[PDB]
């Protein structure tokens, strides 16, 4: 009959059997046990070895599966995905859905896991009670059977399904086979943006209840004005028989002390015509100057849910953390405590490069730590409910959770077809009423929302209504159809700019400054996305924060995204790489768009994460004479583990540094007065530089973890000394083909016919591999791509603007190439126009001045052609001869910094071995930029200045040529880009051209100068 | 909903028409026990759904009913809005649990009083007359059921209307109701005779109810 | 399938390839008889003379009544309520369920009616478009067979239940 009903193709079935969704029950028999939050006897994994065979349908099942395990099957772990164990591949698409749009139906070749777990009950779980099976994530649909009788249905990846067993079991050796289907009817609600793959990839337990036993329980918190009273109310329903000597005990802990307690029988108030549930009891506990909780200081309290009779036998106790705290909306502003919220959030799939989509508590503790020591609040659970044990840590540690319910129909035409349905409004109902009930106790979920991607549909409203029905602390919001809908609370686009309006039809994404007074709006924004971290990005990012500070209603966003979704692949040597879209088979695909992490898969930070943390600092600073003001942005904390370590430095010599203790109060200011400092009798620029360090660790970082910093050029010292004049004077030479110059051991040639720098020698040895030439050029970044591909030219992309104006092949035609002999120098001049059939690009006016102490003085002017598109960059390359191991510059670090990426770097100076002057982006282009650097000291190289450089044993066209990281081979010496000027990497989106105006190279004209020596 | 003929005759004679969705649940307890359990929301929003999907073109409909007598649960606000979502052309009203929640649009009490305050715990029938001034009241009133007629009866109905005549907002109701259920049986001799409750072999019946 | 399924004790199936609701059509052919609101051609009234036999559980309906007509069952008048032909009890309560109030259960002595009709198709019907049978009421739950083979499921008495019998049917008798 199984095979016959085909339940996967009918959205009308999205169940069988399956019981009440509930929050996390251990259903503890000791209530000393529920309180300190112990393992409990009464729930046991069903984790480990399982038996498996993979098969191309569910036709192609052999019925003795039931009743024998299969020979030819083999033993995996569980929780697992099936295509990390090679039995197929995983597919990643972005927006076109992984199937055929056929509403309601799937493939007939719908790969099919059957799993198999032959496990002991002992025999007092089946002499009284109830015995059940949970499964919290199964991708995406199945069937299940015990010992060879089928018990029910379920879809819906990430909730958990579960099933009574009592009848089913058995003592001793007992029989598990689930039928997992790849494909489904919820398939078409599960089109996220991520690696499409399936199989039991959360935890399976078993779960023994008592007969009368908490069906249910709802934690609500609510407050005076002030805060200084709360009441908790505690509702509570049982199932079994009712009786008169039933009472519950909801009871309130810190740490070891009662704080509060209420004890009731059963039956609650009148609630109509018929009278009330005489299966449920509220409970109201009197909250005198409650531990408020919040991301700063997240206070928790237990609560213990005790069943029992009148005399105090206790049937079954269940409990939860409490956080006490109020989320509203107030004259348009997020309230948490009173208090506004800035959101300073990520968000974050589910995503390993070992396990798929599997989660372990090392990884989500992990990304805590990651989180929270980066300056992060919060986090938005993209785009599905998560693994239960996420919540409880975002409890602990202290993050506010938006709980996403999982619908996304992104691939739908329109994108609201089946979301204005009514006959899709059953199986949506359940990813979001399912979610509520399961996630409504946690204190760290704040916010709840409708999916993702799904236009705006009927059926959110419906939805919306029904949480905010069941649910008045929390809002509600959607983005979907517009981002500003009936359907949401919060004004919450995805990838709304700063300033600059996208006036799309329908859907416009206005300025987030320009969102927010519309007429008649009042509703505060915070963007679900924004700053889409693909490759080299997050340009632009500290203008969303400047504006979130300056607008009480813009009260931030979240960044898209975490992790990298890389999954690790072997070579046929045995070493691993990072791969993306199309690299398993996988076609169609959407490429390395699965990659759009602050941090690397195996949780290594990207550069962009250091620009994140500085700019979401909570620490703020003005400087006025000698004063430096502090202003904090926390809402609840005082800065109890904080010191300011202050420095000043003359071109990174340190002159002076000091301590004080920061005591600055939520919202409030401290004055630091610094010492007399030191005037320097030498020329440069003095620099103040300013770490907020915590000296004690926390549960989510270590001693010495620095929060916040900021710089300041204090007094400048220009240099007004003329070098010491040489006595030696540079001979020059002329030839048919060459000039060269002469002095010392150094030795300078200019190529006639190039017209540019071939060769110089220090004594003997030759310094370039490859002349020096201009560069107008760079390896093209994600930003600069866009979605254009090889077969679906998108024009507009900065990419393809740069080729079909011929950027890439245009070619270095000499205009002029004259020598004079000076008095203390030689002077070479030259001219170059670089064309494309017949038009003219570029122009770039150069002298080489080459004096008697053996420096050259290079002057670089360039035209750029009004009408031809702006450049990536203006400078200078060449492939040095030397591979030296260390770096050393004056300038913005340590790490890779860009014009609209470099708030986080400092001035200073650095020193670094060559490999981290490279970023090992797994889509490789131009990368380890270093900005505002004015000396550069490479072997016995040494460049002066005011430029931007790059350095590394990779050519701008190998980055370019080259698709994986793992696929570049180190080239002979070292490619070192000089630039005087570079454009913006941009980053509000990776789809459209996202560099803003003031970070083009639109001048026409530019001027950049630098000295060469040896040292 | 009715017979669809129904509708078209109403439109072309000219009736106002409520048109309820099929959902009692009346004797459940308490009354809202399916109607706030999420999982009875699918079945309930096919019997609404497919109702407006259906009557949405009749003019004679004026006003969206989201059923009767089945307290007021979560599933009542999530449909309530449903439909305002899909029409915002008619009200939608509901009386189930307390007869003025958040889901109706028309204070819509059944056999609520002229005068007299019925103050039933959670659910009263206050007077009309007193209920339209309710502490932060706006809506109207129209009483879905009102002036039960069940054998010699209608006292007091004259008291009614002098009350919708001097209240802008008492804008009528629904007098409970046109025509008696009786079903016709037959005697020893075949002669045809009014049947109410008992009179099949049915038990428990409400006996005389019916009319 | 039909029997091991039990559809109607399941608040999650509602229907079974019901086709979806919308206002009323009578694919009128001819724009002038759509103005007029006059017969149309694409809209056939079943009502009359069908054949109905009564069982005390659907367990006792036997399989043969799926292919063949029942010798032993009455020909009636539809639309009727099989009450008013005297086949069991109309029963009258006001607020108190009918029936045990035990979610989502019903009792195992549920009386199953077992309608038949034998009719024929127009020629064109079965070449080209689309062929489907509306029941306005059914009280309370309904499976449907079309020439022995199964088609699909209905609940909620007031509505419509619609399904697409144009793969079932054949030239002749249906
Ligand atoms: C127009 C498309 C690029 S949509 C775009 O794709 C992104 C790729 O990372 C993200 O998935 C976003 O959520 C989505 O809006
Ligand atoms: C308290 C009960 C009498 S309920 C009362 O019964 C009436 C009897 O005809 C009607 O059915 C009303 O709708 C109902 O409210
Ligand atoms: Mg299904
Ligand atoms: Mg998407
Ligand atoms: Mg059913
Ligand atoms: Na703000
Ligand atoms: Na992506
Ligand atoms: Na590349
Ligand atoms: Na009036
Ligand atoms: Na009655």
Redo the contacts between chains.
């Keep these: 009959?199984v095979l016959?009903?085909r339940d996967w193709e009918?959205p009308?079935?999205?169940?069988?059997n399956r019981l009440?969704a509930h929050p996390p029950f251990a259903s503890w028999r000791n209530s000393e046990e529920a309180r300190t939050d112990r393992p409990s006897q009464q729930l046991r994994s069903l984790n480990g070895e399982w038996r498996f065979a993979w098969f191309p349908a569910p036709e192609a099942v052999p019925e003795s599966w039931l009743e024998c395990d299969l020979p030819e099957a083999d033993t995996v772990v569980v929780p697992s995905n099936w295509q990390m164990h090679g039995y197929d591949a995983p597919i990643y698409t972005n927006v076109t859905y992984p199937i055929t749009v056929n509403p309601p139906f799937v493939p007939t070749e719908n790969p099919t896991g059957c799993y198999s777990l032959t496990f002991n009950v002992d025999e007092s779980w089946l002499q009284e009670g109830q015995t059940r099976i949970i499964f919290d994530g199964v991708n995406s649909a199945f069937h299940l059977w015990c010992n060879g009788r089928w018990v029910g249905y379920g879809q819906d990846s990430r909730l958990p399904s579960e099933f009574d067993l009592s009848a089913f079991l058995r003592a001793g050796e007992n029989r598990l086979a689930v039928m997992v289907l790849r494909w489904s009817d919820g398939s078409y609600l599960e089109d996220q943006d991520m690696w499409r793959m399936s199989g039991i990839f959360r935890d399976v337990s078993l779960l023994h209840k008592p007969t009368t036993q908490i069906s249910d329980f709802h934690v609500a918190t609510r407050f005076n004005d002030d805060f200084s009273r709360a009441v908790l109310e505690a509702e509570v329903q049982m199932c079994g028989e009712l009786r008169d000597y039933l009472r519950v005990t909801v009871s309130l802990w810190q740490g070891e002390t009662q704080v509060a307690s209420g004890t009731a029988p059963f039956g609650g108030?009148?609630?109509?015509?018929?009278?009330?549930?005489?299966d449920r009891v509220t409970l109201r506990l009197n909250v005198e100057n409650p531990k408020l909780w919040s991301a700063e200081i997240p206070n928790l309290y237990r609560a213990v849910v005790e069943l029992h009779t009148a005399d105090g036998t206790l049937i079954e106790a269940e409990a939860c953390d409490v956080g006490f705290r109020e989320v509203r909306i107030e004259n348009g502003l997020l309230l948490l405590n009173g208090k506004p919220l800035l959101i300073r959030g990520v968000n974050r799939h589910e995503h390993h490069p070992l396990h798929g989509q599997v989660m372990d508590e090392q990884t989500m503790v992990q990304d805590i730590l990651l989180m929270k020591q980066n300056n992060f609040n919060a986090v938005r659970c993209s785009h599905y409910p998560n693994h239960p044990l996420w919540y409880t840590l975002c409890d602990r540690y202290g993050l506010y959770v938006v709980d996403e319910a999982n619908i996304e129909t992104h691939g739908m035409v329109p994108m609201n077809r089946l979301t204005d349905d009514?006959?899709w409004?059953?199986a949506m109902?359940?990813r979001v009423?399912?979610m509520v009930?399961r996630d409504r106790n946690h204190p760290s979920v704040i916010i709840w929302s409708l999916g993702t991607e799904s236009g705006h549909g009927?059926?959110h409203?419906?939805?919306?209504?029904?949480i905010?029905?069941?649910d008045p602390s929390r809002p509600v919001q959607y983005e979907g159809g517009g981002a500003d809908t009936?359907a949401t609370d919060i004004i919450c686009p995805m990838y709304a700019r700063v300033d600059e309006d996208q006036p799309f039809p329908a859907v416009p994404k206005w300025s987030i400054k320009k969102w927010l007074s519309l007429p008649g709006e009042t509703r505060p924004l915070i963007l679900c996305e924004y700053a889409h971290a693909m490759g080299n990005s997050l340009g632009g990012f500290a203008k969303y924060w400047q504006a979130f500070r300056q607008y009480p209603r813009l009260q931030g966003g979240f960044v898209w995204d975490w992790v990298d979704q890389s999954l690790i692949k072997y070579d046929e040597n045995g070493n691993p790489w990072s791969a993306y879209g199309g690299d398993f088979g996988d076609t169609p695909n959407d490429r390395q768009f699965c990659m759009n992490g602050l941090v690397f898969a195996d949780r290594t930070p990207h550069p962009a994460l250091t620009e994140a943390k500085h700019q979401q600092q909570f620490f703020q600073f003005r400087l006025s004479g000698q004063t430096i003001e502090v202003t904090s942005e926390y809402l609840f904390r005082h800065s109890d583990n904080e010191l300011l370590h202050w420095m000043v430095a003359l071109d990174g010599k340190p002159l002076a540094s000091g301590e004080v203790p920061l005591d600055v109060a939520p919202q409030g200011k401290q004055l630091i007065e610094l010492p007399e400092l030191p005037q320097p009798e030498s020329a440069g620029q003095l620099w103040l530089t300013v770490r907020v360090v915590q000296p004690n660790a926390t549960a989510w970082s270590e001693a010495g973890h620095i929060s916040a910093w900021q710089q300041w050029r204090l007094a400048e010292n220009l240099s007004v000394t003329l070098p010491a004049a040489s006595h030696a004077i540079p001979h020059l030479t002329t030839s048919e083909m060459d000039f060269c110059i002469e002095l010392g051991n150094k030795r300078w040639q200019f190529n006639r016919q190039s017209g540019f720098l071939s060769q110089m020698w220090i004594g003997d040895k030759k310094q370039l591999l490859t002349p020096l030439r201009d560069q107008f050029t760079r390896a093209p970044l994600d930003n600069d791509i866009g979605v254009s591909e090889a077969t679906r030219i998108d024009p507009n992309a900065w990419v393809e603007r740069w080729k079909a104006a011929g950027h890439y092949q245009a070619e270095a035609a000499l205009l002029q190439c004259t020598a004079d002999t000076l008095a203390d120098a030689v002077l070479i001049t030259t001219a170059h126009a670089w064309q494309h059939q017949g038009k003219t690009l570029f122009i770039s006016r150069k002298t080489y001045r080459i004096d008697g102490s053996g420096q050259m003085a290079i002057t670089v002017d360039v035209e750029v052609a009004s009408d031809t598109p702006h450049p990536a960059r203006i400078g200078l390359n060449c492939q040095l001869a030397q591979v030296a191991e260390r770096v050393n510059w004056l300038g913005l670090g340590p790490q890779e910094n860009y014009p609209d990426r470099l708030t986080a770097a400092c001035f200073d100076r650095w020193d670094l071995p060559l490999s981290d002057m490279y970023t090992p982006y797994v889509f490789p282009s131009e990368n380890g930029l270093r900005c505002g650097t004015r000396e550069l000291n490479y072997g016995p190289h040494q460049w002066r200045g005011d430029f931007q450089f790059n350095i590394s044993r990779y050519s701008q066209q190998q980055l370019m040529e080259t698709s994986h990281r793992h696929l570049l081979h180190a080239e002979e010496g070292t490619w070192l880009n000089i630039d005087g000027f570079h454009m913006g990497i941009g980053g509000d989106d990776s789809w459209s051209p996202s560099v803003s105006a003031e970070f083009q190279l639109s001048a026409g004209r530019y001027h950049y100068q630098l000295v060469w020596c040896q040292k």
């Design positions: 009959v016959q009903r009918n009308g079935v999205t169940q069988l009440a108030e009148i609630i109509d015509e018929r009278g009330g549930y005489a009514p006959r409004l059953p109902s359940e009423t399912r009930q009927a059926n409203d419906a939805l919306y209504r029904w905010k029905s069941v009936t």
